[PDB]
Amino acid sequence: GFGCPFNQGKCHRHCRSIRRRGGYCDGFLKQRCVCYRK
């Protein structure tokens, strides 16, 4: 969806920039991702 498993970077790079480190898409369609750290 919005990202992984097609574009993890889109959801793994957006958060990463926030000093984050890891994540996993949460949905099939353009829903939204929630990088590990909350």
Side-chain angles (χ1 to χ4, degrees):
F2 181 58
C4 17
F6 300 100
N7 213 21
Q8 183 140 258
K10 195 79 165 87
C11 282
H12 173 223
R13 89 196 327 142
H14 163 232
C15 221
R16 173 148 177 159
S17 273
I18 310 303
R19 223 190 253 297
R20 241 75 240 156
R21 256 197 118 67
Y24 260 97
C25 285
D26 323 280
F28 198 92
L29 309 147
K30 271 51 157 268
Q31 276 261 106
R32 162 175 232 283
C33 25
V34 170
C35 15
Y36 183 69
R37 293 102 209 262
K38 200 293 212 95

